[PDB]
Amino acid sequence: GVGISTGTFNNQTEFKFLENGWVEITANSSRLVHLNMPESENYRRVVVNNMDKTAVNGNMALDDIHAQIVTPWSLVDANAWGVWFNPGDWQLIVNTMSELHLVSFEQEIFNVVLKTVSETKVYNNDLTASLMVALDSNNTMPFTPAAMRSETLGFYPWKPTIPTPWRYYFQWDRTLIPSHTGTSGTPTNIYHGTDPDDVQFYTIENSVPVHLLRTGDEFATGTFFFDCKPCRLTHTWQTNRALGLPPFLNSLPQSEGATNFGDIGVQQDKRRGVTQMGNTNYITEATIMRPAEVGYSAPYYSFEASTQGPFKTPIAAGRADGNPRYAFGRQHGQKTTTTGETPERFTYIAHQDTGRYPEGDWIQNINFNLPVTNDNVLLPTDPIGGKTGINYTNIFNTYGPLTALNNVPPVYPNGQIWDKEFDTDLKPRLHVNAPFVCQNNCPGQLFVKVAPNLTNEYDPDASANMSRIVTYSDFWWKGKLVFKAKLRASHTWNPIQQMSINVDNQFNYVPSNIGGMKIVYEKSQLAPRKLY
Amino acid sequence: GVGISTGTFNNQTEFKFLENGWVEITANSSRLVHLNMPESENYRRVVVNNMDKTAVNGNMALDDIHAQIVTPWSLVDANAWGVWFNPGDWQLIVNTMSELHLVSFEQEIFNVVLKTVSETKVYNNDLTASLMVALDSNNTMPFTPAAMRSETLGFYPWKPTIPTPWRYYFQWDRTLIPSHTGTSGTPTNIYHGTDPDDVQFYTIENSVPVHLLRTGDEFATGTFFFDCKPCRLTHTWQTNRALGLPPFLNSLPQSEGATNFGDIGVQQDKRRGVTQMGNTNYITEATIMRPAEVGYSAPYYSFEASTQGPFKTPIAAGRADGNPRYAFGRQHGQKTTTTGETPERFTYIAHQDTGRYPEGDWIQNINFNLPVTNDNVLLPTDPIGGKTGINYTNIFNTYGPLTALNNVPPVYPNGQIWDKEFDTDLKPRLHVNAPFVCQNNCPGQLFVKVAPNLTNEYDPDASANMSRIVTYSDFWWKGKLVFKAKLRASHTWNPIQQMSINVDNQFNYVPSNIGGMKIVYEKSQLAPRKLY
Amino acid sequence: GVGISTGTFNNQTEFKFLENGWVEITANSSRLVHLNMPESENYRRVVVNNMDKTAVNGNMALDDIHAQIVTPWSLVDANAWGVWFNPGDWQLIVNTMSELHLVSFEQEIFNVVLKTVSETKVYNNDLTASLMVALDSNNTMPFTPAAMRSETLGFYPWKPTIPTPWRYYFQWDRTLIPSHTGTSGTPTNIYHGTDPDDVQFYTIENSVPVHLLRTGDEFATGTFFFDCKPCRLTHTWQTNRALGLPPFLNSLPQSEGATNFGDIGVQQDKRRGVTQMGNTNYITEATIMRPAEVGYSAPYYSFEASTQGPFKTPIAAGRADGNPRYAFGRQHGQKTTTTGETPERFTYIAHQDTGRYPEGDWIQNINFNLPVTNDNVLLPTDPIGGKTGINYTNIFNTYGPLTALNNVPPVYPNGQIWDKEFDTDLKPRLHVNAPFVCQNNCPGQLFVKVAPNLTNEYDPDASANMSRIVTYSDFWWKGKLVFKAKLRASHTWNPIQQMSINVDNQFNYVPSNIGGMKIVYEKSQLAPRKLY
Amino acid sequence: KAKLRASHTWNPIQQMSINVDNQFNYVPSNIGGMKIVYEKSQLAPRKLY
């Protein structure tokens, strides 16, 4: 009954090598999850509004108006790389593997303990009390991944963790007409309420079965099996200038040295080749016809509005703009013995050259008078709209049928692993937040909640909140994430870039004298691959 | 023989309930189709040229220039929702069923009657004459959905209807350089004839078989079978702002009313999460990363020109830009007792929030100093090219690899049901005119004509038009259009928007004192669905 | 054995007729290939840096700065139409076929002869020397289509050819800030070096097994089988204005001649139809709701900057911009008896009307008042950014989900046949340079070299380059390429445009007085096809 | 019953084609005026000996 344990701790990573070059990587994780009771048992609808700061002109991007259903439940989320892989295993994966397939995911809650607090304080075991656990096997609830806010389980096996109090967006209608510093007057800035057509009030109790676990009980999610396409751990460097056959060089440097360039022998208007410029005889590396377009230029720092307020248009890649910035706390990589409230931050400067350098772009007139006059070219120095700070590249969009693009790299430790595909009829080609996209269904979210230990005084017909015995739970969570990965091959003569310890990064990977630990970010897409 | 009927009028619709929550909806439609003989038996080539109205400057958008091959044949087109379902049936579909598939379509012409007019007028039956009937099973003829002109069969089972006189576009070449009022001089508004490379002249006689039905026998089309992807009768509300985990709220409200907002606890630069703004520490609902972009800004009221003159660039989702405006006559929904040429009109404001609100958009500089100065933000108040009426969002496109979109909702009664997919090598994601799109083949267009009932005076070598006995026919047409649809389930606590008779809309659904009838538009995506 | 011949020349085209209107076209091509020894045996990294030309302001598009590995091997590339089909066979293909599949490809080297030169010049057979032959079956090396540079095998069977010296792009980092004439000073124009993360050095010696052929031996590339989607040899004349049912004409013309137009009978504001304009009652051929968008506008002559320097952003289809312009030499179509270095050129004006006419574009305000005032309309004549030459259509992009597009047409003789699909995670819709794209694997590149005939004086410790017995090889190359094409059917009444000989082009196709030859370009997509 | 031809020679042969001159012989007029014009039956050359 009470006295017998209900599952073994396990945080080992198993590397089951197979011939034909594949490895089945089984990341086991376990944590002690601590769960206080809810602040209130009721479901609440809370409207956030920050007109106190957004109504100041120019602060348009600081909009936080939204409506959310704050729930009495907490969510246990393992959807982040740091939950599964320590730095050494991640080093092995990035340094040796070439592509990475996510295979399966499973979860267990075991060794549940329930304790009452009495008050000096004394702690009493509630052998009769119970922990509610619910699995959204059918994904009826809104998908609410916690890595976006840095609220997943902790990344250290030996520290307890806490689950995030769960909430989801309710519908609101809001408009915020933008304005600059020195605008003549107060812009239109109001919250409209909500549309009856879009009301969606979800509850765990009506949506999913809820298991009650006392002390001896276990909950075990059966193995979810993914079908996701591979993530590739090797970046592409070939931009459009470096696709295809280079021009033949007649003048080769006959004294080997840095300053001794080679020269194409033939004048620029007398070369052979193909250009996509029907009226231009000059064949140059800028003009010559490549097969297609790598990357695309996007309107950078463009905010677009609809019924629920303004939001940034996301970008697939960056040079800066576009590169993601992760801000995170002490459970998720910041040095655990820091005292401050300020989060740790990095921006992931990805290796891949799919981005654009907008300071070098231009458009010039169709006539192509070659040493261009001012009237025949539009540069990034030139205004648009009369504004000196905004140039044409800010409003430019060169996505097209010829665009080629890469899926987003995995960002260790804070980045997501999987994401649910949109229910839209026309589905986005990639997601900017996760490398793998569940196409048909995704793993069930796991919700937890400690039951009400009522006092003797309860009367449902009283207006006041129900009195509850102050209770908390600690339960051990375990999970197993299976990947299938391909080992790399040495195509080139030269060696590749590899993650390695060095004198600078040495003390990031080991604990300090007073016990503190950190996890620095480590790049994934290290080895180069041919684009074409 | 002559006196035996050859078919049953049937305008019922059965709902056949299959296992596992599917309903096979069999829509039967029957119509008495009345057909006058053609104005001329010869195929004509006619150029329309409103140079007079487009030469006055500013009237560029009123360009009606086209060439077409006026044809003796007439087309029976049943490709509109109103031909099949009445308002009660449409209510039962949309209020209760979540997705809808096409299954099959078939047609029958039966009970042909031929009559001749002689001068007072005496009407006499011609048992020897024949209705010429042709089916383009192979889709060799140019496709012409009659819904875009509101020339489908009538939507009332009792009234007789008429088929559309058939015609199809011919080649032509045109240039219309645009011009505002107050332009110095006349633009080059000229018609260049037809490219010989592009000539296609089609005739029913040379292309498809033809059946000479007479009064005593039927024509029947085999059961065509669709393979289209499901149209979904439910709408998505979630803007980018409403995807993912909302921020945690630390100060929940303690009293009722709209004044009691809840507040996020920590300062915007000390919050935690993932933004896609590498140089910016502010994490806000506008700046926080989302999986992908729902909807896209498109350059609104952009007219774009090809060899065949200007046309509007279509837009996939409206907010009134984008939303379709239907103009229709007394066969097809207008109150039949009204006088006057003027059509009735509605604009279909769809429920879905995949649109944009252009006045709220803005673009600002990479540096992102927070209270943005005038020189550093381009607003919709700012003129492109010095034109005060044309702000940047008119000339602005944000389609990209992250755009997600829904298919167009069904529009009742005038919207198309199915559409033929293009024979392009690269095919569009969606068609803006119908929910279902035929992937490889589509239902054959049914062409009808009455044979030349000649007089004794005929001489083919005479230049003048042939003398014909004035003939007309009535033939009963029977269609059967089968759907398969899934019954909805109540996942939310709250109820959904539903179509209902009420005191306002009551008398739209019953005939008037002198028997006038109308069919109002009814919204096809009522129940909300979970995008993420 | 030395003297036994090891193959047979074959340059025939067999048209083999299958069931159901298919034709298996077996193009055989045979050439004599002449290969001198490499200039030096070592691999050379060379950087081209033409700062002398581009440091002059406005010479931005003349950027030729790049790095490459100059490799001693030479590439034998048959990837062009002229290598396989002569003008008569191409006439038969374009005039009689409708779609053209690509089936298989195989290669052979046979009748190798090696010779050496001794000083008058004496030519001596090298019975013991060998020709190195290497097939990259796995595509380890970068794909390198020689047709982009016009360095394929020559198109005349009776004339010898030389293979291209192989080279491939190394990585380089570059910034080139653009400038117009009379910019204040020298802008940033610098070569940064190479990123170590992107270095890739490939040797044929390590990546492929190298065969050694002396004289009596052969190498036969086994049959590679493609899986490419079909190329269509018909062109789409319909643009958006010619999709759907034309408006009904009440006023048909009653007399002959182009100056007797027909007229639509109903005023534009009392006209039935559908429009994507919620606030506009005017239904007209510009505004009527078409199914989708055939073609798209793109920013014309837009140059975009990557990490490696500016490049021309490509366009899918042209009207001009977008139409490819070829420059080609004596082996590849120019008059073979001409003096001078200048290449022969053509611009391939494709027959398909999917392109745009930017001078006909206009954008007008959402209110849509008809005689548009200057402030409410933006025209292609209006300046943007204060520049008079550049207008909004240079910045504009209409690409959206509704875009439909055609694949790149074949260009006879200088265009490619196949190209390798990019290894990116999201791949382009089409390629602008080859009609067929290999889906997963593409036929192996064949690299050839003559092995070193060292002198007796060789010493690897010597500072100077090695000494070699001057040697060269002639080897006969044969290839077989199989297509599968569908014969056309005469759907129209009218004849189609067809390739023909006539008095203007008569002496292009037959040799001249002193034996000169040329191959004039021939258009592929002749017969019209209907989209809709 | 007819035999499809074969391209024996290097050069392109004469072929029947629509062009700017003969275009409106093969499509009707304003008032249904229709015509058919003579088209040459024998176009490809043949080696007699």
Coordinates of N, CA and C in Angstrom, one line a residue, chain B residues 15-25 89 91-101 231-234 484-491 496 498 527:
Chain B
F15 N -31.0 12.8 -45.6 CA -29.9 12.7 -44.7 C -29.8 11.3 -44.2
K16 N -28.8 10.6 -44.7 CA -28.6 9.1 -44.4 C -27.4 9.0 -43.4
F17 N -27.7 8.5 -42.3 CA -26.8 8.5 -41.1 C -26.0 7.2 -41.1
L18 N -24.7 7.3 -41.4 CA -23.8 6.2 -41.4 C -23.2 6.0 -40.0
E19 N -22.5 4.9 -39.9 CA -21.8 4.6 -38.7 C -20.6 5.6 -38.5
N20 N -20.2 5.7 -37.2 CA -19.1 6.5 -36.8 C -19.3 8.0 -37.2
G21 N -20.5 8.5 -37.1 CA -20.7 9.9 -37.1 C -20.7 10.6 -38.4
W22 N -20.9 9.9 -39.5 CA -20.9 10.5 -40.9 C -22.3 10.5 -41.4
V23 N -22.7 11.5 -42.2 CA -24.0 11.6 -42.8 C -23.7 11.8 -44.3
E24 N -24.4 10.9 -45.1 CA -24.3 11.1 -46.5 C -25.5 11.9 -46.9
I25 N -25.3 13.1 -47.4 CA -26.3 14.1 -47.7 C -26.5 14.0 -49.2
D89 N -32.4 23.1 -45.2 CA -31.4 22.1 -45.3 C -30.0 22.6 -45.0
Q91 N -29.4 25.1 -43.0 CA -29.4 25.2 -41.6 C -29.0 23.9 -41.0
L92 N -29.6 22.8 -41.4 CA -29.3 21.5 -40.8 C -27.9 21.1 -41.1
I93 N -27.3 21.5 -42.2 CA -25.9 21.2 -42.5 C -25.0 22.1 -41.6
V94 N -25.1 23.4 -41.7 CA -24.1 24.2 -41.0 C -24.2 24.2 -39.5
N95 N -25.4 24.0 -38.9 CA -25.5 24.1 -37.5 C -25.0 22.8 -36.8
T96 N -24.9 21.7 -37.5 CA -24.7 20.4 -36.9 C -23.5 19.7 -37.4
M97 N -22.9 20.0 -38.5 CA -21.8 19.3 -39.2 C -20.6 20.1 -39.3
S98 N -19.4 19.5 -39.1 CA -18.2 20.2 -38.9 C -17.4 20.2 -40.2
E99 N -17.4 19.2 -41.1 CA -16.8 19.2 -42.3 C -17.6 18.5 -43.4
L100 N -17.3 18.8 -44.6 CA -18.2 18.4 -45.7 C -17.3 18.0 -46.9
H101 N -17.7 16.9 -47.5 CA -17.0 16.3 -48.7 C -18.0 16.3 -49.8
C231 N -14.0 20.5 -47.2 CA -14.3 21.9 -46.8 C -14.8 21.8 -45.3
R232 N -14.3 22.7 -44.5 CA -14.5 22.7 -43.1 C -15.5 23.8 -42.8
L233 N -16.6 23.5 -42.1 CA -17.7 24.4 -41.8 C -17.5 25.1 -40.5
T234 N -16.3 25.4 -40.1 CA -15.9 26.0 -38.8 C -14.8 26.9 -39.0
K484 N -20.8 14.0 -48.2 CA -20.6 13.2 -47.0 C -20.0 14.2 -46.0
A485 N -20.6 14.2 -44.8 CA -20.3 15.2 -43.8 C -20.3 14.6 -42.4
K486 N -19.5 15.2 -41.5 CA -19.2 14.7 -40.1 C -20.0 15.5 -39.1
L487 N -20.7 14.9 -38.2 CA -21.4 15.6 -37.2 C -20.5 16.2 -36.2
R488 N -20.8 17.3 -35.7 CA -20.0 18.0 -34.7 C -20.1 17.4 -33.3
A489 N -19.2 17.8 -32.5 CA -19.2 17.5 -31.0 C -19.0 18.7 -30.2
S490 N -19.6 18.7 -29.0 CA -19.5 19.9 -28.1 C -18.3 19.8 -27.2
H491 N -17.2 20.2 -27.7 CA -16.0 20.2 -26.8 C -16.0 21.3 -25.8
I496 N -22.3 27.5 -29.1 CA -21.7 28.1 -30.3 C -22.7 29.0 -31.0
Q498 N -25.1 30.0 -33.9 CA -26.0 29.2 -34.7 C -26.9 30.1 -35.5
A527 N -19.5 27.6 -36.2 CA -18.9 27.1 -35.0 C -17.4 27.4 -35.0

